[PDB]
From a paper:
AtPSAT1 is a dimeric PLP-dependent AT that, similarly to other α-type ATs, binds the prosthetic group in the cavity within the large domain. The three crystal structures of AtPSAT1 present snapshots along the catalytic event showing PLP internal aldimine state, complex with PMP after the first half-reaction and PSer-PLP geminal diamine intermediate state.
PLP is bound inside the active pocket with its pyridoxal ring π-stacked with W171 on the re-face of the cofactor. The protonated N1 of the pyridoxal ring is H-bonded to the carboxylate of D241. Another hydrogen bond is created between the hydroxyl group of PLP and T221. The phosphate also forms contacts with residues of the AtPSAT1 dimer mate, particularly hydrogen bonds with: the side chain amide of N306∗, the main chain amide of T307∗, and the side chain hydroxyl group of T307∗. Altogether, before the catalytic event, the PLP prosthetic group in AtPSAT1 structure presents a very conserved conformation in the internal aldimine state similar to that observed in other ATs, where C4′ atom of PLP is exposed to the entrance of the pocket. In case of the other two structures, the electron density maps are blurrier and with no meaningful signal for the side chain of R397, which indicates a flexibility of this region.
Numbering used by the authors:
A (entry chain A): 69 to 430
B (entry chain B): 70 to 430
The structure:
């Protein structure tokens, strides 16, 4: 519409209006430099200030320890599915996986090209609705690392606490909950994520990697997938995604202005609770299949008992400016993605719409 | 706080009308209710944008349906690995004609994945020439022949193309992409980063003959696999949506300019102004590149009085002409004069050169 809508898309996703308007204001001529960020040399002093400020702001938000590197890369999280075992394993090493949704399953399949994989536990048998108890996971005695997807974007399953790796280090795909809450980074060897879900536009992927794990990639690693190359060149080995990194920088600066990630988590909890409570109080009209203690604050899948009404629910919500609510083809129903930048008012509008819908169709 | 004349070699200057369109669309693209930066890549609005970008590019370069057009991430440098990973077995051979340092980087990365033969290198004469094609000793069972069509640092550009004795021709056209017509049917693959001539950094275009798609090496990352990208129309994973949108705006505007025959005329005219100024300078300024292969896009030049190069660059920047410093190896200057560099910018540099020479000769 002529007014902006409430955008429940799962990735790419909604961004803060103030960030967008700042980008608009500066698009033709950034800070009297005489050019757009889209036209800046990546080796020039203006872009250097942008990428350095983005890294500094991110380090502050997540309280990233000095002994970790921060890389700003292209190729999405799917490229990292290959880069991780290429950098961190030899061809006969094993990576352990806990698979809580389909994103972890894709990571397994790609890793098989480059090392051995072991899926300790899969949620598939119960339609990806739970996280296992950690103590009873049988880890591979010589596994290089343990891989999790911290927020399974399709399935709505989120780690709250983290497993402790037995032999190696912990790797987490945090694409769809990145900068939604504090994380004790020191518990991980690698955290990675596409920016597009929670912290910027598509085209930028962030890798936070303990410095002692950088180096000794497999010989077949493309130079563009090599962590040492990226780290020693500060993400400027080749031409980076300049504009994407600038946009991420705006988002980080704004999250700090909001009070940092403790405050961000409080708002995310508050708005998620309105939606989960609406569902739970609906006497089964709406249903969420995910086990209560691991319900994602970012992605909320739900269905109707009267599934024949789902298409109508989605179409009518779009007429009321709540878009991209359709769920995954495997389950149908709906998926409300409610990332950092989803206004509280959008969640309130959806909850009120659900009320009205239920009353009309009970 | 006026806009400057921006001679950077990549990323690079973009058309002002395109930047202003992007500004106007940024918060809410066509009353869709969101930015391009917030669109689902599987939604109807983004699908219209990527499809229009492909169509417009096919019209502009005259890319027939026997070729796929892929919009990817990773830069041209990712394609240095993807090409042999997709197109070669580990014991196949690829021939290289190396006319500058970008081709040399392509050779180094290909060695990881297959055998390489550098059948000609310009290095011994400081990368100033293109070989005579008839005299190249091509490998009889080469899978493909790789060239860099425009060597961005060295200013050496192919005007005519060699005929592969076996296999097909692959060209890195990063720094001359959509600067002039190209007979696409002569090639197996044309590739290039968008950031020099057609958009911002973060998108790479790959134009690939459909019969060449598939059969990648088993070690090929899914994100480097041409069959995966082709069968999913560049939407296998989350594409660089905003970058593709920007490339689309550029392609639309190049069509509005009259297409690539017209773009080439403008490029030739403004390059000639600069090269003529260099050659008429009685040696004060010098271009090392052999005349018939001088790039229309990247113009490297030095001063006879090398000690004045720093003053030249600094004073030019005071006159709103920025990013003219040349490569560390040969010093001097490099004026990158891509499609979107205004004619007035080249005129100003030419005037600046004339005044500088009068002052210091």
């Amino acid at each position: 519409s002529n007014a902006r809508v409430f955008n429940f898309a799962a990735g790419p996703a909604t961004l803060p209006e103030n960030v967008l308007l700042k980008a608009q204001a500066d698009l033709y001529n950034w800070r009297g430099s005489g050019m757009s960020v889209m036209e800046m040399s990546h080796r020039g002093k203006e872009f250097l200030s942008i990428i350095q400020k983005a890294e500094s702001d991110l380090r502050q938000l997540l309280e990233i320890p000095q002994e970790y590197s921060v890389l700003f890369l292209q190729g999405g999280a799917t490229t990292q599915f290959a880069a991780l075992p290429l950098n961190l394993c030899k061809s006969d090493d094993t990576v352990d996986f806990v698979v809580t949704g389909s994103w972890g399953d894709k990571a397994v399949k790609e890793a098989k090209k480059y090392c051995k994989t072991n899926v300790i536990w899969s949620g598939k048998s119960e339609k990806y609705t739970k996280v296992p108890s950690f103590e009873e996971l049988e880890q591979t005695p010589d596994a290089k690392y343990l891989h999790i997807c911290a927020n399974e974007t399709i399935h709505g399953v989120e780690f709250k606490d983290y497993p402790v790796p037995k032999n190696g280090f912990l790797v987490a795909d945090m694409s769809s909950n990145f900068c939604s809450k504090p994380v004790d980074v020191s518990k991980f060897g690698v955290i990675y994520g596409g920016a597009q879900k929670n912290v910027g536009p598509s085209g930028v992927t962030i890798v936070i990697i303990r410095k002692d794990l950088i180096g000794n990639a497999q010989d077949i690693t493309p130079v563009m997938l090599d962590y040492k190359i990226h780290d020693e060149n500060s993400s400027l080995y080749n031409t980076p995604p300049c504009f994407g990194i600038y946009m991420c920088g705006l988002v980080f600066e704004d999250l700090l202005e909001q009070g940092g990630l403790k405050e961000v988590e409080k708002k995310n909890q508050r708005k998620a609770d309105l939606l989960y409570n609406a569902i739970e109080e609906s006497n089964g009209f709406f249903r969420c299949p995910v086990e209560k203690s691991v319900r994602s604050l970012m992605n909320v899948p739900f269905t109707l008992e009267k599934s024949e009404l789902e298409a109508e629910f989605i179409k009518e919500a779009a007429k009321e400016k709540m878009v991209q609510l359709k769920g995954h083809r495997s389950v149908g129903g709906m998926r409300a993605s409610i990332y950092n930048a989803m206004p509280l008012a959008g969640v309130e509008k959806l909850v009120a719409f659900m009320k009205d819908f239920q009353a009309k169709h009970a």
